[PDB]
Curated annotation (Swiss-Prot):
This is Methylmalonyl-CoA carboxyltransferase 1.3S subunit. Residues 1-77 form the Biotinyl-binding domain. It comes from Propionibacterium freudenreichii subsp. shermanii. The chain holds residues 47 to 123 of 123 of the full protein. Changing residue 41 to M: Reduces activity 10-fold. The keyword Transferase applies. Changing residue 42 to A/C/T/L: Reduces activity at least 10-fold. It is an enzyme of class 2 (transferase). It comes from the Bacteria. Transcarboxylase is composed of three subunits: 1.3S, 5S, and 12S. The core of the enzyme is composed of six 12S subunits. On each side of the core there are three pairs of 5S subunits. Each 5S dimer is attached to the core by two 1.3S subunits. Thus the total number of chains is 30 (6 + 12 + 12). The modification N6-biotinyllysine is found at residue 43. Signal peptide: none annotated. Keywords: Biotin, Transferase.
């Protein structure tokens, strides 16, 4: 009953765009505010900042991949 969303572990996307480049990978740690991945929608590059401090345990989003607003982008832990 859901096309794609996040909240628990997975960070929700700001809008349904396209993955341009990945900044964080499984093994590197991130901080609440630091960019984790770049998005591309409406011909406008949008930076994705982590919601809280943690580490990337698994990246569901990949380069040249389509995402959805709210859909889990990356898992933090």
């Amino acid at each position: 009953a859901g096309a794609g969303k996040a909240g628990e572990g997975e960070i929700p996307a700001p809008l349904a765009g396209t993955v341009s480049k990945i900044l964080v990978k499984e093994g590197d740690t991130v901080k609440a505010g630091q960019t984790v991945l770049v998005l591309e929608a409406m011909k406008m590059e949008t930076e994705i900042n982590a919601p809280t401090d943690g580490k990337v345990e698994k990246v569901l989003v990949k380069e040249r991949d389509a995402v959805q607003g709210g859909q889990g982008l990356i898992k933090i832990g």
